[PDB]
Enzyme design. Sequence first.
Site, short mmCIF file in Angstrom:
data_model
loop_
_atom_site.label_atom_id
_atom_site.label_comp_id
_atom_site.label_asym_id
_atom_site.label_seq_id
_atom_site.Cartn_x
_atom_site.Cartn_y
_atom_site.Cartn_z
N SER A 174 1.04 -1.15 0.16
CA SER A 174 -0.16 0.05 0.19
C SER A 174 0.84 1.21 -0.05
CB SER A 174 -1.00 0.08 1.16
OG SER A 174 -1.76 -1.38 1.33
N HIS A 199 -4.67 -5.44 -1.49
CA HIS A 199 -5.31 -5.23 -0.32
C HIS A 199 -6.25 -6.51 -0.01
CE1 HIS A 199 -3.61 -1.50 -0.80
NE2 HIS A 199 -4.23 -0.94 0.17
N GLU A 220 -1.27 -2.65 -8.20
CA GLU A 220 -2.41 -2.76 -7.42
C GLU A 220 -3.11 -1.56 -6.70
OE1 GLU A 220 -3.52 -3.25 -3.84
OE2 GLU A 220 -1.54 -2.34 -3.01
N1 LIG Z 1 -11.68 0.75 9.80
C1 LIG Z 1 -11.31 -0.19 8.78
N2 LIG Z 1 -12.27 -1.13 8.97
C2 LIG Z 1 -11.85 -2.30 7.71
N3 LIG Z 1 -10.82 -2.19 7.08
C3 LIG Z 1 -9.87 -1.27 7.35
C4 LIG Z 1 -9.99 -0.28 8.27
N4 LIG Z 1 -8.94 0.54 8.28
C5 LIG Z 1 -8.15 -0.06 7.43
N5 LIG Z 1 -8.59 -0.92 6.86
C6 LIG Z 1 -7.77 -1.85 5.65
O1 LIG Z 1 -6.46 -2.00 5.97
C7 LIG Z 1 -5.99 -2.13 4.93
C8 LIG Z 1 -4.61 -1.63 4.80
O2 LIG Z 1 -4.76 0.04 5.18
S1 LIG Z 1 -3.36 1.04 4.39
O3 LIG Z 1 -2.23 0.32 4.43
O4 LIG Z 1 -3.35 2.06 5.54
N6 LIG Z 1 -3.83 1.35 2.92
C9 LIG Z 1 -3.19 2.32 2.32
O5 LIG Z 1 -2.14 2.50 2.71
C10 LIG Z 1 -3.70 2.52 0.99
N7 LIG Z 1 -5.13 2.60 1.12
C11 LIG Z 1 -3.29 3.69 0.47
C12 LIG Z 1 -3.41 3.88 -1.10
C13 LIG Z 1 -4.58 4.46 -1.68
O6 LIG Z 1 -5.32 3.48 -1.70
O7 LIG Z 1 -4.55 5.46 -2.00
C14 LIG Z 1 -6.80 -1.74 3.55
O8 LIG Z 1 -7.14 -2.71 2.73
C15 LIG Z 1 -8.23 -1.49 4.25
O9 LIG Z 1 -9.28 -1.75 3.80
#
Ligand SMILES: Nc1ncnc2c1ncn2[C@@H]1O[C@H](COS(=O)(=O)NC(=O)[C@@H](N)CCC(=O)O)[C@@H](O)[C@H]1O
Lengths: 335, 335
Positions: A112, A305, A237
């Site tokens: 990510s 993810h 991705e």
């Molecule tokens: N409250 C919540 N409820 C359920 N799922 C949750 C959540 N908080 C985080 N997630 C899940 O955790 C996974 C990883 O999160 S994460 O690493 O921060 N994601 C990222 O850095 C990327 N989203 C950044 C790139 C982009 O999309 O622009 C992601 O797949 C996200 O779905």
Amino acid sequence: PLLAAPLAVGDTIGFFSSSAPATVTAKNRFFRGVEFLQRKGFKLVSGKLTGKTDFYRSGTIKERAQEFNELVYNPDITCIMSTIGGDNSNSLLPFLDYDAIIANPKIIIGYSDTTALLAGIYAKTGLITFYGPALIPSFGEHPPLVDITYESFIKILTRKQSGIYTYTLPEKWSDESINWNENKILRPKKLYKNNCAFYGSGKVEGRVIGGNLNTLTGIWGSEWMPEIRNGDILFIEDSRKSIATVERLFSMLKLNRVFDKVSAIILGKHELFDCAGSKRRPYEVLTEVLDGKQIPVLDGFDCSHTHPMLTLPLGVKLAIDFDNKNISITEQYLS
Amino acid sequence: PLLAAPLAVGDTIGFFSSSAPATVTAKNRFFRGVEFLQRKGFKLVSGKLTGKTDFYRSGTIKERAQEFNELVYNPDITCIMSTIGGDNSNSLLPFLDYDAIIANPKIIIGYSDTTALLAGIYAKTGLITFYGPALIPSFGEHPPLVDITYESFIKILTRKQSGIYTYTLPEKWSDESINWNENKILRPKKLYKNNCAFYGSGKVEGRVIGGNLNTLTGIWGSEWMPEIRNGDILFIEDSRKSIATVERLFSMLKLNRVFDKVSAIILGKHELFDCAGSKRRPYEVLTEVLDGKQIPVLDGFDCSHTHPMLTLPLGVKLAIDFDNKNISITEQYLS
Ligand SMILES: Nc1ncnc2c1ncn2[C@@H]1O[C@H](COS(=O)(=O)NC(=O)[C@@H](N)CCC(=O)O)[C@@H](O)[C@H]1O
Ligand SMILES: Nc1ncnc2c1ncn2[C@@H]1O[C@H](COS(=O)(=O)NC(=O)[C@@H](N)CCC(=O)O)[C@@H](O)[C@H]1O
């Protein structure tokens, strides 16, 4: 390329929070992930920003760079693992100790937002880093899917570096946004049959480059963006994006002549893609953007993810066999 | 630079939808914008995708490029105006008729996602384009704010090209998310005193370059991104972003050595900025990213998603007088 020492049962893994402070905001899942790896026999070193918050991030730009650097300086650590992504890893790049990374190569793993670090470190040092598990989202996942993620993690990082490695295909997968940060599941996730598709024929072998595509925009054009070359396999991705955003990012690649260079594209499964009612998949959007340019595509690789997640070395040769519907690592990626 | 003919009351304005299909999804506001400009005496030509929808966009990549090109080919049109932004203007760039643009320069105006086109056209042709009103969001705005937007639009585009032009700061502004596509109004928008700040000393004069920063990521690194040069004034604005995204975008600029080149930075007012409870403004985030670099900043210029909106030529010299707290255009920008 520069290669890290392989992982072994009983090794020490250090973790860092280069963006979102999820050791606080997802503390239950964090604790589950910690316990999961400890029960596998790993010793864990907590990065200095564990348990800290600066609103949307774990600390200042410099604090976060310091946290990462301190793990690099620790001779006991074999693997440096992201706790979670976010948005802000790219900020750290001017402040990482690249000389220390070269002097003390370690397994650097995450996904990510952490793409900024994985790609940036590779660009600066030639170190083969890994698109793979982050402690909280990946190892804090409830059974059954976490076990499949772990199986890939341990296989890739501990196996003997002899002959090619051909990936297993997860039987089932999910992308549902449930069961995040509580002791018990609300209910079991929907388990989808693996709908990975191989668009093309023959075998394509080339160096794999990429990661989270949206994150790559934060390092694009800079000395920290690895140069994409003729014959490369592009791995990309994204997560929870609208079709509008996906078209934008694909067109960005087009404008940058990426599709004039690459011999194949790997699309990681897109977590909860929002088609805006069009019922179109990312591959269809890519096809329009390509404008007749014939590039074979592996659509739906389980390195994204979605759960479970496979571990993938970046910057080494892969071979995709489009006829036999498999994907292999063909170049040594650890010492 | 390549210069378009000045606008005159009574001229024909053509409009195009290079991304979001808002002539359908915001039909009431669209009609208000049409009626507003017609009452001023302008003739309007509707682009061929007016009233069409392809879910998240107005049409295919090629059809959107054709819509724009057809307005360029129309000899009666003196101004080509975006209806609204979105996400997907960058897709059009390989298919725009740049040679036709050179052969018959026109005023090209819009903002937000349309930045991809404004910057791309400038990169390929040297045409001075305009960061300014889009038909639906800008001219479909209810009085009194629309009148101030119009005053700038008409002043900039019709004035004699003799001597410098110094901007008049709007007395009041708003970013409140009400009265969008509703037929009538219950109350006027909340009005805020202009809190535009000049951080620096002396006078800075340089070519202005930029636009919507998030949108620039879609063209970055390509032949359609105009090269930022030593002495440039960087103009950037964003809308409805988290502080996390803002840090990411500022750090992207830092990694690209942009802050080593620019003589000043103009930050457009950020519509409904989400500080994530930190109470920090974009300027504070920029200051951290700059890591001590003494770049003078005009923080809160009224050329962004906030109302009212000023019209700004891109690719010509501006002078920012930080001591006298004003900003001027110092280079001819229309023929
Ligand atoms: N409250 C919540 N409820 C359920 N799922 C949750 C959540 N908080 C985080 N997630 C899940 O955790 C996974 C990883 O999160 S994460 O690493 O921060 N994601 C990222 O850095 C990327 N989203 C950044 C790139 C982009 O999309 O622009 C992601 O797949 C996200 O779905
Ligand atoms: N349903 C709604 N209710 C109330 N306001 C609405 C609205 N739909 C659009 N708006 C307002 O319209 C203005 C212009 O929209 S717009 O041009 O499509 N915006 C854009 O292209 C940029 N947002 C894209 C760049 C980016 O931020 O990533 C924006 O200021 C936006 O606030």
